[PDB]
Amino acid sequence: STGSATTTPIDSLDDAYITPVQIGTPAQTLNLDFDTGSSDLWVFSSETTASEVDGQTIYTPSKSTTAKLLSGATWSISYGDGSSSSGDVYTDTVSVGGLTVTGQAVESAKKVSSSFTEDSTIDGLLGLAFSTLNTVSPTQQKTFFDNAKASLDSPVFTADLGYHAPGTYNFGFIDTTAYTGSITYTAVSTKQGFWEWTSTGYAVGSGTFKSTSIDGIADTGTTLLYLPATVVSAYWAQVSGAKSSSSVGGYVFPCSATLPSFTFGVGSARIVIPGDYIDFGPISTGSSSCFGGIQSSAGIGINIFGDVALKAAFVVFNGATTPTLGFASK
């Protein structure tokens, strides 16, 4: 089997992407944030504290003839940005782009933090990291991909995120029309439960490539590119007036600037992030200070190849017995 679904930016900045997901019988379609940095499929629901729901579409398990309470199971998750959610668990039928999993754990939120409430466009998350990170207790649950894998034509999914445009998540096949040149594959460590890999270096604009190993995670659920302070300083030094602002929470730059590109290495291959992808616009409405899309990972504890990086590539998440990651230009 295979599946193919369009993923759409939630706003004009590509802050996140939403993908429609069918849950239950008859189908209830919710728009979920596919997150290769976590491993829980959770939704706003009829159980979510009413004051914490503001415009989201909810899953109502009592209206699904295939929903079953997973008795005794609870979940609770905290994300790198400080947001969180928790609740109980149902199993139900879940379909993405025509690919159906029966008995998928659907984690129903009883509580969500303010950032989730305030984002009316995201109805929940669909985790695509390794199932070892799943938070359900006392019986850990599998991700949608893990459940689908054996049925797929090939044990892979691909992320093809757009810049200010829709893109695609495919399951079970590689669309050879969706990228240019060849796909370069690179090793993955699953030790921390992430799609963790090592970039071979970087360049700033038309500058020379610096060969250096940068360990990080491919994370579709993180907006920006978080890299070591040395690398980030070298990038922003090429933008007149750019500076790190403790008050704003990162590097800012004059909105009048033209940003240089940023290149990262994948083995001997190179992925070029155009300068425009690194512009996250005014820090506040009407400001002439703009927020940068490359930020320091210092104090996160891990480097993160978030959407800024991933949307410059066609990315293969290869879930074979020994997982790997592939990157192609597009």
Complete DSSP assignment for 45-100: BTTS-GGG-SS---B-GGG-TT-EEEEEEEEEEE-TTS-EEEEEEEEEEEEETTEE
Q: So where are the chain's domains?
A: 5-174, 175-330
What are the strands, taking DSSP E only, across 148-292?
Answer: 156-160, 167-171, 184-187, 196-204, 210-218, 225-227, 243-245, 250-254, 262-266, 269-273, 279-282, 289-292
- Could you confirm whether 88 is annotated as catalytic? no
**Geometric angle at alpha carbon 254, from 252 and 256, rounded to 5°:** 145
DSSP string, 182-217: -PEEEE-B-TTSS-EEEEEEEEETTSPPEEEEEEEE
Closest CA to 272 of 214, 223, 207: 207
Of these residues, 33, 35, 119, 219, which one is catalytic? 35
Q: Is residue 14 within 8 Å of 223, Cβ to Cβ?
A: yes
Of these residues, 108, 199, 261, 297, which one is catalytic? 199
Sign of CA dihedral 19, 88, 172, 38: positive
Strand-pair category, 184-187 with 196-204: unpaired
> What is the experimental resolution, given in Å to one decimal place?
1.1
- One of 2.40.70.10, 2.40.30.10, 1.20.1250.20, 1.10.150.120 is the CATH number of 175-330, namely 2.40.70.10
N residues, the chain: 330
Q: Is residue 67 within 8 Å of 60, Cβ to Cβ?
A: no
Q: 5-174 with 175-330: one CATH topology?
A: yes
Class of domain 5-174: mainly beta
- Could you confirm whether 199 is annotated as catalytic? yes
Contacts 24+ apart (CB under 8 A), 321-327: 323/188, 323/190, 323/195, 324/185, 324/186, 324/187, 324/188, 325/185, 325/186, 325/188, 325/195, 325/197, 325/218, 326/183, 326/184, 326/185, 326/186, 327/183, 327/184, 327/186, 327/266, 327/269, 327/271
